[PDB]
Write a protein that binds this DNA or RNA. Structure first.
Ligand SMILES: [Mg+2]
Ligand SMILES: [Mg+2]
Ligand SMILES: [Mg+2]
Ligand SMILES: [Mg+2]
Ligand SMILES: [Mg+2]
Ligand SMILES: [Mg+2]
Ligand SMILES: [Mg+2]
Ligand SMILES: [Mg+2]
Ligand SMILES: [Mg+2]
Ligand SMILES: [Mg+2]
Ligand SMILES: [Mg+2]
Ligand SMILES: [Mg+2]
Lengths: 205, 156, 226
RNA sequence: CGUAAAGCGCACGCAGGCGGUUUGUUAAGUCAGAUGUGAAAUCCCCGGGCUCAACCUGGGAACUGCAUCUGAUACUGGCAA
RNA sequence: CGCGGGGUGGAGCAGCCUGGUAGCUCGUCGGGCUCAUAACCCGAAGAUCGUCGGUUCAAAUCCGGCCCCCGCAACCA
């Protein structure tokens, strides 16, 4: 129920850094990011309208590590909610526990963050939570349990988080290894290379 | 700053005495994403020449649409030959839910939210004409009030 | 400058075509019918003519180029004299379809005429054979009749003054296409839809066309004096 | 619904459908309010409980309906001139 | 050489991002304008987008090479 194949392959098909590697090195030093995977990779794929919508949807899914059935449920929930459907969908994806623990920095990648959550290293509000998709609420506190507070992977992940734009909507402390989810992020705080209208249009066909 | 889009390229034939003369037609739409949109139809013996003629023709003969915050003013109906085209203002976030040709023209004219539905022949040439005619026959509260001799608040 | 009902009526501006040829759109400006001929209501002509004169004056003051278009046998020489004497441009032979909308191609012909004309002054048509001195001379004659009034215009004009809206429908339509206002003397059998400044009145009498042209030429002259 | 499928060959005419203008009246249609009812579950909204979700659950909304009572009288109907 | 930036009519600048349009200012030629010059106006001429290549219906634009320019770059007794 999880993609286990090569990671940089997806980044090359999207033609964009999907943050599937930690960031110790450059993606251009780790792969040929400019070339699509496979035998016919150098060719320039002329993409139709359905193609551009599909590629946008696949980019978001591969960033967050969400398969299609669960992602479709997210769209249904986002459409049901009040406001804007695309911004609501991005809000749900950002509220996933894997994304939150990654954003505060207890994980090099979202795969590393997901393994920590799965292996019961994380506590929200004082309770061990094993479920990756768990939707964290505003004012919640996410912590690394004492048993796992020794892991060198956590330490090095915190260092790498210091080298990225620090999210404005969460409050982290690397001494106690506890973060606070203050509010739900807005479209101003998320990367604007996403094009949510394509996803909304795709699911409205 | 004018976004351009080629909607359809189509090969036609003339059947001269010696045989068939194949030529190409290109349908394109240009717009400034802020209420101005035009369409151009160009023919030539090669695809690049055809699209070029169409783009130039489309940059000229553009018109102005009274857009309301990326949406329509009110539900409009457009009709050209055998193509009918219904369009409706929608709420922010819906996207542009329109058909095949209507998608290109609305995107380039700056409409970000609309509910559209084509009734009748979906020939791209006639569809583009009908949707542009509908967008052109759409009035805003300011001009409606000026026409009726009232204030906008009087018309609400 | 200023005209009045008596002057218009002496020149025969009130006369129109016969009833069976009229334009229903032209009904408002029709006074009555006398002996199966329409009569044009000068009470509409005078204020419209004065209003057209005011707009023409304003364009002339802003250094706008005025294209005098009239090609009937009754107004060819009249329009040539008025445009020469008002320092503006004219067409008084068959209007070339696309003079305005196809200005790029028409401009290449203008350049050809200028080169041919200078060559004639220089003497180029001496080295070539006698036939090549008559062919080129014949080419210059034709190019003068057609584009001899707009060889110095150098661009699209800012107004057209068309004598006959009926006869010169092509010129009016090209003007409407480009964006150029039209001031047109419009008879009873003509369509005033494409005209921006309609001036009802007879357009076939030499006396009437001379009346309109003298007034228009004086207004443009005074507006350029400024 | 001229030519793509589609105006009965034409007319008269019963039932039926529709009805110029004015006043008065009635209150049938119509509209407004109120009351009773429209089982619970299900769908929808705001919450709560299962580590999350599915699932379960509290309250609300809704159930576009019907019936009765009290009003309005523009329009349609009835009656009268 | 290292890293970064730049090259578009004679000059100075947009256009590049989103692939389809050579624009803006000065200058040059001719005319009007001026007695003439100046000022002003109108035209006309002037770039193949450093070059070599690839991408692709289509390249100033996307990619690479070479050419140069500029900033940074650790070295002078
Ligand atoms: Mg499953
Ligand atoms: Mg059909
Ligand atoms: Mg038949
Ligand atoms: Mg038939
Ligand atoms: Mg019959
Ligand atoms: Mg009958
Ligand atoms: Mg009645
Ligand atoms: Mg009742
Ligand atoms: Mg119930
Ligand atoms: Mg819960
Ligand atoms: Mg419940
Ligand atoms: Mg009654």
């Amino acid at each position: 129920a999880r993609y286990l194949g090569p990671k940089l392959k997806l980044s090359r098909r999207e033609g964009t850094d999907l943050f599937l590697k930690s960031g110790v090195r450059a993606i251009d030093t780790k792969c040929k990011i400019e070339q699509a995977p496979g035998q016919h990779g150098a060719r320039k794929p002329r993409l139709s309208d359905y193609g551009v919508q599909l590629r946008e949807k696949q980019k978001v899914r591969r960033i967050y590590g969400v398969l299609e059935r669960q992602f479709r449920n997210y769209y249904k929930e986002a459409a049901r909610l009040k406001g804007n459907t695309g911004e609501n969908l991005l809000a749900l994806l950002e509220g996933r526990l894997d994304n939150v623990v990654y954003r505060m920095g207890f994980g090099a990648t979202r795969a590393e963050a997901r393994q920590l959550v799965s292996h019961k290293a994380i506590m929200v509000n004082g309770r061990v939570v094993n479920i990756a998709s768990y939707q964290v609420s505003p004012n919640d506190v996410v912590s690394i349990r004492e048993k796992a507070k020794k892991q060198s992977r956590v330490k090095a992940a915190l260092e790498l988080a210091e080298q990225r734009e620090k999210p404005t909507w969460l409050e982290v402390d690397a001494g106690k290894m506890e973060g606070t989810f203050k509010r739900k992020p807005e479209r101003s705080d998320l990367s604007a290379d996403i094009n949510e209208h394509l996803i909304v249009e795709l699911y409205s066909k | 700053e004018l976004q351009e889009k080629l909607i359809a390229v189509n090969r036609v034939s003339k059947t001269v005495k010696g045989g068939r003369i194949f030529s190409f037609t290109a349908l394109t739409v240009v717009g400034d994403g802020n209420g101005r949109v035009g369409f151009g139809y160009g023919k030539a013996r090669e695809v690049p020449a055809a699209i070029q003629k169409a783009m130039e023709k489309a940059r000229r003969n553009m018109i102005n649409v009274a857009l309301n915050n990326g949406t329509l003013q009110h539900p409009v109906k457009g009709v050209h030959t055998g193509s009918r085209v219904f369009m409706q203002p929608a709420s922010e976030g819906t996207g542009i839910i329109a058909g095949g040709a209507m998608r290109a023209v609305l995107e380039v004219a700056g409409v970000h939210n609309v509910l559209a539905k084509a009734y009748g022949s979906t020939n791209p040439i006639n569809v583009v004409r009908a949707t542009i005619d509908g967008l052109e026959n759409m009035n805003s509260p300011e001009m409606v009030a000026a026409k009726r001799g009232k204030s906008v608040e009087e018309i609400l | 400058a200023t005209v009045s009902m008596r002057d218009m009526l002496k020149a025969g501006v009130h006369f129109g075509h016969q009833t069976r040829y009229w334009n229903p759109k032209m009904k408002p400006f029709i006074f009555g019918a006398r002996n199966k001929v329409h009569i044009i209501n000068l009470e509409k002509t005078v204020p419209m003519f004065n209003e057209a004169l005011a707009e023409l004056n304003k364009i002339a003051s802003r250094k706008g180029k005025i294209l005098f278009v009239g090609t009937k046998r009754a107004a060819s020489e009249a329009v040539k004299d008025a445009a020469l004497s008002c320092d503006q441009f004219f067409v008084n032979h068959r209007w070339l379809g696309g003079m305005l909308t196809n200005w790029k191609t028409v401009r290449q012909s203008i350049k050809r005429l200028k080169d041919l004309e200078t060559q004639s002054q220089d003497g180029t048509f001496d080295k070539l054979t006698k036939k090549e001195a008559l062919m080129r001379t014949r080419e210059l004659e034709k190019l003068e009749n057609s584009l001899g009034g707009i060889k110095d215009m150098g661009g699209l004009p800012d107004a057209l003054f068309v004598i006959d809206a009926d006869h010169e429908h092509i010129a009016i339509k090209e003007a409407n296409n480009l964006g150029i206002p039209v001031f047109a003397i419009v008879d009873t059998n003509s369509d005033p839809d494409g005209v921006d400044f309609v001036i009802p009145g007879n357009d076939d009498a030499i006396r009437a066309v001379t009346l309109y042209l003298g007034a228009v030429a004086a207004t443009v002259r005074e507006g350029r004096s400024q």
